[PDB]
């Protein structure tokens, strides 16, 4: 939601709101076995010990 | 067996001729090295 406040206002009261659903990226999905199919090969993202 | 570009084909046609003798030259990678040191502003040469 892009909120546009006003120019002269004690709060910057809302001049406008533009609310819409923007697509950002595709996130890979863990299959039901704990793998990811990334470029057709099955990959496991290994836990790190840091 | 490896780098000699003119020696590897002579060795091939020598084996096929039944003459197991080599005519070895300079490895090509040594020439690559000489050209990669001369591009460093260092004149490396071969003294006849």
């Amino acid at each position: 939601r892009l909120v546009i406040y006003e120019r002269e206002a004690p709060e910057g009261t809302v001049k406008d709101i533009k609310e819409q659903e923007v697509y950002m990226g595709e996130i890979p999905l863990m299959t039901d076995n704990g793998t990811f199919v990334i470029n057709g090969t099955e990959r496991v993202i290994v836990s790190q010990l840091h | 067996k490896s780098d000699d570009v003119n020696g590897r084909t002579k060795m091939y046609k020598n084996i096929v001729d039944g003459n197991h003798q080599m005519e070895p030259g300079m490895p090509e990678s040594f020439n690559v090295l000489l050209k990669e040191i001369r591009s460093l502003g260092i004149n490396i040469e071969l003294e006849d």
Partner: protein, 50 residues
């Protein structure tokens, strides 16, 4: 007790949030322009960094 298992859903969130700051520096750069009345939020979001 001093080493910690950081796992798939945490590394993936770290990378997603890196992508989010990449896009939000650009949307801060775009929000301070003067075309501000006629643009929708999906015109200033770049899905490709994220």
């Amino acid at each position: 007790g001093n080493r910690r298992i950081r796992s798939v859903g945490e590394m993936a969130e770290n990378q997603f949030r890196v992508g989010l700051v990449r896009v939000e520096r650009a949307v801060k750069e775009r929000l301070s322009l003067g075309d501000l009345d006629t643009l929708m939020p999906q015109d200033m979001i770049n899905a490709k960094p994220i």
